[PDB]
């Protein structure tokens, strides 16, 4: 085993376990006993003060540990820009690989986790890892030499296919037709068994200003307000001529004929929004940020950026079948999608700005989480304009 340590001055994580459903507790209990036997983990005393949240996801349960805090405190240790171009990418869960590898003995105490007992009837069961834990930053790292080795063949055999490893995940991307792609994957899983994304289509949609037979005082008002704000992203947007028609105290419903200057002004603005603001470039030294707005009726808008108004990417996510009566479900779904694209494109997860109440999210997000990694997040209060603005994003002619 190689000696791993925490960043200088960093102490072990002591994150409190959130309550879990009986169903989930039973599951973890079963899962952990089995691991205990296989010597993957061991019960621990109270002398170990650390702890990390744990839970179960998905028809059987998979154990998911929340190592965000530990990953952060773990000492530090490349991205293939070609992945983002590939026609299709399939993701694979390779966390099982780790269990074989032993975790340095002196570091194990920091992986300590707790299984909760319903109605505090019994103190929870304490465990710590002996082997590489899935979800920990160090695991994919430590098990790197080993991963290359097992990948070399397939890679060298197919230099046309790009493979990228993120945490427990492996993103394999090629250009073959759908069938020939899925075939190459199995050839890989088989290769691994012995030890559906599409980037080229992720098109950047533009902001689209309304167009009306006739405009009303209101129509302009709402319009001028949005253009004004948007002025922060495109300095060339002008509302002068538009604000002139808005002179006086007419009824909000009265129709205003447009001057030709206003018509041109509107035209220049439409042309400016035709494309994404210039000079936006990704910076590795800076964190990625993803903001989500609830547009409502299953529609959501997001923008990935590092500097305000300098979007690296923006998009729309429509809820998925069988998620209607659940806001939280849609949101977690979208968070996972966006995080995925984020990894695919930059090889890292963005910190999230979620339009939801801390308590609301922390009570139900795990119920629909399906990735092995967990992004960072913070809760916010959507500024009405930001919402109105991206609500203006263009959509397919008929669809797709």
What is the nearest approach in angstroms of another protein to the Cβ of residue 93? 27
List CB contacts of 114: < 8 A, sequence separation 6 or more.
Answer: 17, 51, 54, 124, 125, 126, 127
Cβ atoms of 334 and 301 closer than 8 Å? no
11 annotated to a ligand binding site? no
* Breaks in the chain after residues, C-to-N cutoff 2.5 Å: 58, 77, 195
- 336 makes contact with another protein (CB under 8 A): no
Cβ atoms of 262 and 245 closer than 8 Å? yes
168 annotated to a ligand binding site? yes
Taking contact as CB under 8 A, which single stretch among the options 185-193, 195-203, 216-224, 263-271 is the one that binds another protein? 216-224
DSSP string, 129-165: ESBPPTT-THHHHHTTHHHHHHHHHHHHH-TT-EEEE
- 234 makes contact with another protein (CB under 8 A): no
169 annotated to a ligand binding site? yes
Could you give the 3-state DSSP secondary structure of residue 371?
coil
Rounded to whole angstroms, the Cα distance separating 320 from 67 reads 28
Among 1, 105, 106, 118, binds another protein (CB under 8 A): 118
- 235 makes contact with another protein (CB under 8 A): no
- 384 makes contact with another protein (CB under 8 A): yes
- 133 alpha-carbon distance from chain centroid: 21
Rounded to whole angstroms, the Cα distance separating 59 from 51 reads 28
- 296 makes contact with another protein (CB under 8 A): yes
Residues between 337 and 356 that touch another protein (CB under 8 A):
354-356
Taking contact as CB under 8 A, which single stretch among the options 191-199, 206-214, 343-351, 384-392 is the one that binds another protein? 384-392
**Which of 254/378 has CB closer to another protein?**
254
What is the nearest approach in angstroms of another protein to the Cβ of residue 77? 26
β 376-379/299-307 pair status: unpaired
Encoding tokens for residue 61? 């349960």
Cβ atoms of 50 and 56 closer than 8 Å? no
Could you give the 3-state DSSP secondary structure of residue 399?
coil
Residues between 360 and 379 that touch another protein (CB under 8 A):
360-361, 363-364
- 119 makes contact with another protein (CB under 8 A): yes
**Which of 91/207 has CB closer to another protein?**
207
From residue 77 to residue 116, the character string flagging contacts with another protein as x (rule: CB under 8 A) and all else as - is: -----------------------------------x-x--
- 303 makes contact with another protein (CB under 8 A): no
**Which of 289/356 has CB closer to another protein?**
356
List CB contacts of 306: < 8 A, sequence separation 6 or more.
Answer: 282, 283, 286, 287, 288, 289, 312
- 214 makes contact with another protein (CB under 8 A): no
Number of residues that bind another protein (CB under 8 A): 63
What is the nearest approach in angstroms of another protein to the Cβ of residue 356? 4
- 5 makes contact with another protein (CB under 8 A): no
Beta bridge partners of 294: 300
Among 62, 126, 191, 310, binds another protein (CB under 8 A): 126
CA pseudo-torsion sign 92, 59, 199, 307: negative
Rounded to whole angstroms, the Cα distance separating 356 from 353 reads 9
Residues in contact with another protein by CB under 8 A are 14, 16, 19-23, 25, 45-49, 51, 112, 114, 118-123, 126, 216-218, 221-222, 224-225, 228-229, 246, 249-254, 293-294, 296-297, 325-328, 330-331, 354-357, 359-361, 363-364, 381-382, 384-385, 387
Q: Which residues are annotated as a binding site for Mg(2+)?
A: 93, 168-169
Q: Which residues are annotated as a binding site?
A: 93, 168-169
């Amino acid at each position: 085993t190689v000696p791993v340590k925490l960043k200088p001055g960093m102490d072990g994580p002591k994150v409190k376990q959130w309550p879990l459903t009986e169903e989930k507790i039973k599951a973890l209990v079963e899962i952990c006993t089995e691991m205990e036997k296989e010597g993957k983990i061991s019960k621990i005393g109270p002398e170990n003060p650390y702890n990390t949240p744990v839970f179960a996801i998905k028809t059987k349960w998979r154990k998911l540990v929340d190592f965000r805090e530990l990953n952060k405190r773990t000492q530090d240790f490349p991205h293939p820009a070609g992945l983002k171009k590939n026609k299709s990418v399939t993701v694979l869960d390779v966390g099982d690989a780790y269990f074989s590898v032993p975790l340095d003995e002196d570091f194990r105490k920091y992986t300590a986790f707790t299984i909760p007992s319903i109605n505090n009837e019994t103190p929870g069961i304490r465990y710590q890892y002996n082997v590489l834990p899935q979800g920990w930053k160090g695991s994919p790292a430590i098990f790197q030499s080993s991963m290359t080795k097992i990948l070399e063949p397939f890679r060298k055999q197919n230099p046309d296919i790009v493979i990228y490893q993120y945490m427990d995940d492996l993103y394999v991307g090629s250009d073959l037709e759908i069938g020939q792609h899925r075939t190459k994957i199995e050839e890989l899983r088989q290769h691994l068994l012995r030890w559906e994304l599409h980037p080229d289509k992720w098109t950047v949609q533009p902001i689209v200003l309304p167009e009306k037979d006739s405009w009303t005082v209101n129509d302009i008002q709402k319009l001028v307000g949005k253009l004004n704000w948007a002025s922060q992203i495109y300095p060339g947007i002008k509302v002068r001529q538009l604000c002139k028609l808005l002179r006086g105290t007419k009824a909000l419903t009265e129709v205003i004929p447009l001057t030709e200057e206003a018509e041109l002004e509107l035209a220049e603005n439409r042309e400016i929004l035709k494309e994404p603001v210039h000079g936006v470039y990704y910076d590795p030294s800076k964190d990625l940020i993803a903001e989500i707005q609830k547009q409502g009726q299953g529609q959501w808008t997001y923008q990935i950026y590092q500097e305000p108004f300098k979007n690296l990417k923006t998009g729309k996510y429509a809820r998925m079948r069988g998620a209607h009566t659940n806001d939280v479900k849609q949101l977690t779904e979208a968070v996972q999608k966006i995080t995925t694209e984020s990894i695919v494109i930059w090889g890292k997860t963005p910190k999230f700005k979620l339009p939801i109440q801390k308590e609301t999210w922390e009570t139900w997000w795990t119920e629909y989480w399906q990735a092995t990694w967990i992004p960072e997040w913070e809760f916010v209060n959507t500024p009405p304009l930001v919402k109105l603005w991206y609500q203006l994003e263009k959509e397919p002619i008929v669809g797709a």
